[PDB]
A paper describes a structure:
Methionine sulfoxide reductase (Msr) is a family of enzymes that reduces oxidized methionine and plays an important role in the survival of bacteria under oxidative stress conditions. MsrA is stereospecific for reducing L-methionine S-sulfoxide, whereas MsrB is stereospecific for the reduction of the R diastereomer. The catalytic activities of the MsrAB fusion protein are higher than those of the individual enzymes, MsrA and MsrB.
The crystal structure of HpMsrABC44S/C318S was solved at 2.2 Å and belonged to the P1 space group. Each monomer of HpMsrABC44S/C318S had two catalytic domains, HpMsrA (34–192, residue number) and HpMsrB (206–357), which were linked by the linker region, iloop (193–205). To understand the fused form instead of the separated enzyme at the molecular level, we determined the crystal structure of HpMsrABC44S/C318S at 2.2 Å, which showed that a linker region (Hpiloop, 193–205) between two domains interacted with each HpMsrA or HpMsrB domain via three salt bridges (E193-K107, D197-R103, and K200-D339). We found two acetate molecules in the active site pocket, which was used as the crystallization buffer (0.1 M sodium acetate). In the active site of the HpMsrA domain, the carboxyl group of the acetate ion interacted with Oδ1 of E85 (2.50 Å), OH of Y75 (2.60 Å), OH of Y125 (2.79 Å), and Oδ of S44 (2.93 Å). Therefore, both the active sites of HpMsrAB were reduced. In addition, we found that the linker region (Hpiloop) connecting HpMsrA and HpMsrB was mandatory for the higher catalytic efficiency of HpMsrAB based on biochemical and kinetic analyses.
Numbering used by the authors: 34 to 357
């Protein structure tokens, strides 16, 4: 069925508009949560002690509560008390309010993970929803009605891909010796480089996703692939900012930047600053031997269905940008 979670994260105008853009969110509405009364209004907030919140109805088949929270973490200061941006006050406190007992454990785990990486003392409170009142219809869909309205957060973050670092694992070195070809092993494990113009993917122009051949972790979208003329698969950026790592490479009497996968720590290739201007200028020059391409039609079967709308939206954007 459909599930609900209530999120207080400062300005509810931008928050509501943000959550609405997340894939899996059926509806987002503005409101007032966990105050001292059973009903209030926008200029009785300071007395009712309600927090400006967003009621988020989501499809648990399409997005989990855990990933939904991690989208929410991207647009709030998790350590500040009663303040987000320039909005000061108790109605701007951060909080997560649940109506299902089983949601408490998920929320608590997500906050500890968030804390374990951004550090500090997480100020986000966690309580069951006690009393709630839907905001005035003047406040509903506010940024749709006022495209120049106040919005402190970056709504583009809602289009970013989140890749779970715990659903892909690197098999043992002994398993990789049987699962990978000789070439794939040397490239990914010993930093060799396959031959340019003689590898499977450098000239592939097909919609889908490229994953770490050693772990299955998503790495690159077909929407960011382009023809570099260099003979290796070339991308303008990874599928998000978390899946690849960067390291100095001083071999071959050159100085270069090696790119590696986050989970598998596999050698992928290198990143250069000679990519096409209109795509950002970077060239991620990746070995086919480090990648496994999964076409759009196959992504659901292979366990990557939650990334399909992201590949397709990327390919629509590439399609339109071509039309200039």
């Amino acid at each position: 069925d459909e599930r609900v979670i209530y999120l207080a994260g400062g300005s509810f105008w931008g928050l509501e508009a943000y959550m609405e853009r997340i894939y899996g969110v059926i509806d987002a509405s503005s409101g007032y949560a966990n105050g001292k009364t059973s009903s209030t209004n926008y200029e009785k907030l300071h007395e009712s002690d309600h927090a400006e919140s967003v009621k988020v109805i989501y499809d648990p088949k399409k997005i989990s509560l855990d990933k939904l929270l991690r989208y929410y973490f991207k647009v709030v200061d998790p350590v500040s008390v009663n303040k987000q941006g320039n909005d000061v006050g108790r109605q701007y406190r951060t909080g997560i309010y649940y109506v299902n007992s089983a949601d408490k454990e998920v929320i608590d785990h997500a906050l500890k993970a968030l804390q374990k990486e951004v550090k500090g003392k997480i100020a986000i409170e966690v309580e069951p929803l006690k009393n709630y009142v839907r905001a005035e219809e003047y406040h509903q869909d506010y940024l749709k009605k006022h495209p120049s309205g106040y919005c402190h957060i970056d709504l583009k973050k809602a289009d970013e891909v989140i890749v779970d670092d715990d659903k892909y694992t690197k098999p043992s070195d002994e398993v990789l010796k049987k699962k990978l070809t000789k070439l794939q092993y040397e490239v990914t494990q010993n930093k060799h480089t396959e031959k340019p113009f003689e590898n499977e993917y450098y000239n592939k122009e097909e919609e889908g996703i490229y994953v770490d051949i050693t772990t299955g972790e998503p790495l690159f979208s077909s929407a960011d692939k382009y023809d570099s003329g260099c003979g290796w698969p070339s991308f303008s950026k990874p599928i998000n900012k978390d899946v690849v790592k960067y390291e100095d490479d001083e071999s071959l009497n050159r100085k270069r930047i090696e790119v590696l996968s986050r989970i598998g720590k596999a050698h992928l290739g290198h990143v250069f600053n000679d990519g096409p201007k209109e795509l950002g200028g970077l060239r991620y020059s990746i070995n086919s031997a480090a990648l496994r391409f999964i076409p759009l039609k196959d992504m659901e079967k292979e366990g990557y269905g939650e990334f399909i709308p992201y590949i397709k939206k990327g390919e629509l954007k590439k399609y339109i940008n071509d039309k200039k």
